[PDB]
UniProtKB/Swiss-Prot annotation, chain A:
Detected in skeletal muscle (at protein level). Fast- or slow-twitch skeletal muscle. This is Ryanodine receptor 1. The N-terminus is blocked. Channel activity is modulated by phosphorylation. It comes from the Eukaryota. Belongs to the ryanodine receptor (TC 1.A.3.1) family. RYR1 subfamily. Binding of [3H]ryanodine indicates that the heterozygous channel is activated by Ca(2+) concentrations 4-fold lower than normal. Single-cell analysis of cotransfected cells shows a significantly increased resting cytoplasmic Ca(2+) level and a significantly reduced luminal Ca(2+) level. The chain holds residues 4700 to 4747 of 5037 of the full protein. Caffeine binds at W17. It is found in: Sarcoplasmic reticulum membrane. Homotetramer. Can also form heterotetramers with RYR2. Identified in a complex composed of RYR1, PDE4D, PKA, FKBP1A and protein phosphatase 1 (PP1). Repeated very high-level exercise decreases interaction with PDE4D and protein phosphatase 1 (PP1). Interacts with CALM; CALM with bound calcium inhibits the RYR1 channel activity. Interacts with S100A1. Interacts with FKBP1A; this stabilizes the closed conformation of the channel. Interacts with CACNA1S; interaction with CACNA1S is important for activation of the RYR1 channel. Interacts with CACNB1. Cytosolic calcium-activated calcium channel that mediates the release of Ca(2+) from the sarcoplasmic reticulum into the cytosol and thereby plays a key role in triggering muscle contraction following depolarization of T-tubules. Repeated very high-level exercise increases the open probability of the channel and leads to Ca(2+) leaking into the cytoplasm. Can also mediate the release of Ca(2+) from intracellular stores in neurons, and may thereby promote prolonged Ca(2+) signaling in the brain. Required for normal embryonic development of muscle fibers and skeletal muscle. The calcium release channel activity resides in the C-terminal region while the remaining part of the protein constitutes the 'foot' structure spanning the junctional gap between the sarcoplasmic reticulum (SR) and the T-tubule. Pore opening is mediated via the cytoplasmic calcium-binding domains that mediate a small rotation of the channel-forming transmembrane regions that then leads to channel opening. The gene is RYR1.
From Swiss-Prot, chain B:
Detected in skeletal muscle (at protein level). Fast- or slow-twitch skeletal muscle. It comes from the Eukaryota. This is Ryanodine receptor 1. The calcium release channel activity resides in the C-terminal region while the remaining part of the protein constitutes the 'foot' structure spanning the junctional gap between the sarcoplasmic reticulum (SR) and the T-tubule. Pore opening is mediated via the cytoplasmic calcium-binding domains that mediate a small rotation of the channel-forming transmembrane regions that then leads to channel opening. Belongs to the ryanodine receptor (TC 1.A.3.1) family. RYR1 subfamily. Residues 101-129 form the EF-hand domain. Cytosolic calcium-activated calcium channel that mediates the release of Ca(2+) from the sarcoplasmic reticulum into the cytosol and thereby plays a key role in triggering muscle contraction following depolarization of T-tubules. Repeated very high-level exercise increases the open probability of the channel and leads to Ca(2+) leaking into the cytoplasm. Can also mediate the release of Ca(2+) from intracellular stores in neurons, and may thereby promote prolonged Ca(2+) signaling in the brain. Required for normal embryonic development of muscle fibers and skeletal muscle. It is found in: Sarcoplasmic reticulum membrane. Binding of [3H]ryanodine indicates that the heterozygous channel is activated by Ca(2+) concentrations 4-fold lower than normal. Single-cell analysis of cotransfected cells shows a significantly increased resting cytoplasmic Ca(2+) level and a significantly reduced luminal Ca(2+) level. Homotetramer. Can also form heterotetramers with RYR2. Identified in a complex composed of RYR1, PDE4D, PKA, FKBP1A and protein phosphatase 1 (PP1). Repeated very high-level exercise decreases interaction with PDE4D and protein phosphatase 1 (PP1). Interacts with CALM; CALM with bound calcium inhibits the RYR1 channel activity. Interacts with S100A1. Interacts with FKBP1A; this stabilizes the closed conformation of the channel. Interacts with CACNA1S; interaction with CACNA1S is important for activation of the RYR1 channel. Interacts with CACNB1. The N-terminus is blocked. The chain holds residues 3975 to 4167 of 5037 of the full protein.
Length: 48, 193
């Protein structure tokens, strides 16, 4: 439950080697869970 | 002795013909809801043949010639086997897609129904079926009025009758895979199913 705070923070992959984990998760689960829901959960902007 | 006699008999031709007839008959009967009973009976008969095939595979060895003949018969009727597997897995995926949240936000009618156009849009958004598969699913899903489709009944209607035959097919495929290793032909059937 404590790890739910950094889900949508822009600095989530900070201090870690990979910075594109959120994009991979979006590509993996957008067609099932919903692209809009994934974007809101991870705090991403599709146009950006 | 009986197993050898059946292996050297003309049983494989009858099995291939039965597989072709079963595939086409089930594909045609799935569209109409007034023939469901017949379809159920059809499925039962199919299961019995699989049981007989299992009886032919009982008490064999690794790389046995009977299993090789069974694989040769299967690859001789590859198209019908692929059609049957597609029939099983399409309806298997339909129930999972219906319960997905994307479908729940796609349906807007509060009566529990959905239009054909919105159903097609939801399936295209899910990205799991091809266009002909969408057309076949639409044909099988009857619409009472204004293209309203009851997705719950449509998903739950084809589940129970086809469970036993699907389990028998899975068991037969697993047995053939485990008793005929290093056979590239069977890997395609394993991947499809």
């Amino acid at each position: 439950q404590w790890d739910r705070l950094v889900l949508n923070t822009p600095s989530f992959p900070s201090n870690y080697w990979d910075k594109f984990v959120k994009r991979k998760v979006l590509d993996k689960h957008g067609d099932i869970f919903g692209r809009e829901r994934i974007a809101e959960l991870l705090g991403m902007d599709l146009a950006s | 002795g009986n197993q050898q006699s059946l292996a050297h008999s003309r049983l494989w031709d009858a099995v291939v013909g039965f597989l072709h007839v079963f595939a086409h008959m089930m594909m045609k009967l799935a569209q109409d809801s007034s023939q469901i009973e017949l379809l159920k009976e059809l499925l039962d008969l199919q299961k019995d043949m699989v049981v007989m095939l299992l009886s032919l595979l009982e008490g064999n060895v690794v790389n046995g010639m009977i299993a090789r003949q069974m694989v040769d018969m299967l690859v001789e009727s590859s198209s019908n086997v692929e059609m049957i597997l597609k029939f099983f897995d399409m309806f298997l995926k339909l129930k999972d897609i219906v319960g997905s949240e994307a479908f729940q936000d796609y349906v807007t009618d509060p009566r529990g129904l959905i239009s054909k156009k919105d159903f097609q849009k939801a399936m295209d958004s899910q990205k799991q079926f091809t266009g002909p598969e969408i057309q076949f699913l639409l044909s099988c899903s009857e619409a009472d009025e204004n293209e309203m489709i009851n997705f719950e009944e449509f998903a739950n209607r084809f589940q129970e009758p086809a469970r036993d035959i699907g389990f028998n097919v899975a068991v037969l495929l697993t047995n053939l895979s485990e008793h005929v290793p290093h056979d590239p032909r069977l890997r395609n059937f394993l991947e499809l199913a």
